[PDB]
């Protein structure tokens, strides 16, 4: 909530940096744009390392990915 807290405050956001440039002359640790350097080390999503989940509406609970690989772990079991 407080990015340039105990400082001069927010001056602006540089989208060249994707960062909150404070009123004091230092970049904050907060980002503003999604086009910034967020170090991503864990994610979400099923049918990963594939073409994604195949978008057909299968009547059975068995599911498959767009590459053809079966993601039975993401699918419900029987």
């Amino acid at each position: 909530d407080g990015c340039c807290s105990k400082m001069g405050g927010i001056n602006y956001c540089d989208s060249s940096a994707g960062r909150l440039v404070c009123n004091n002359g230092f970049y904050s640790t907060c980002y503003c744009t999604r086009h910034a350097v967020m170090d991503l080390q864990f994610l979400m999503g099923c049918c990963l390392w594939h073409g994604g989940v195949y978008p057909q509406l299968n009547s059975s609970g068995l599911v498959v990915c767009n590459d053809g690989y079966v993601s039975e772990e993401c699918s419900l079991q029987k």
Partner: protein, 140 residues
């Protein structure tokens, strides 16, 4: 004891940021193409000979013009108290020059103008007759 960093301004805008990030590469491309053109052809002559300086050209002028040549040159000749001469015929497509300078010589302004004209119009000055002549080029 409060820390600071010196260069602080008004907050900027993202569109200006993207304009700057395009303009830096545009200027870099212009710089390298001008360098390679200067290397690939050696110049020999300048318009100092065609437009020599004389007296009563020291009255300075700062301009922002974005129209045709002839009205601007008429104002220049009016301020310069020199006779006006036109040669050739005006083409169908007009010649338009944008000039944004700051307090230069009239001779240097005129040399800038004929450099802007390139191979469409040419400028000559006869201080023996106190005249300035422009000429449209033979073309097509």
């Amino acid at each position: 004891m409060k820390f600071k960093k010196p260069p602080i301004n008004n907050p900027s805008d993202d569109a200006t940021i993207k304009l700057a990030e395009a303009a830096v590469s545009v200027s870099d491309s212009m710089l390298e193409m001008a360098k390679v053109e200067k290397v690939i052809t050696p110049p020999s002559k300048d318009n100092t000979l065609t437009i020599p300086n004389a007296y009563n050209l020291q009255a300075r002028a700062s301009v922002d013009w974005s129209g045709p040549i002839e009205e601007l040159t008429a104002r220049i000749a009016k301020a310069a108290h020199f006779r006006f001469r036109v040669l050739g015929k005006s083409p169908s497509v007009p010649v338009l020059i944008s000039i944004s300078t700051k307090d230069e010589s009239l001779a240097e302004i005129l040399r800038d103008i004929d450099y802007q004209a390139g191979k469409k119009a040419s400028i000559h000055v006869y201080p023996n007759s106190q005249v300035v002549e422009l000429r449209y080029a033979k073309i097509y």
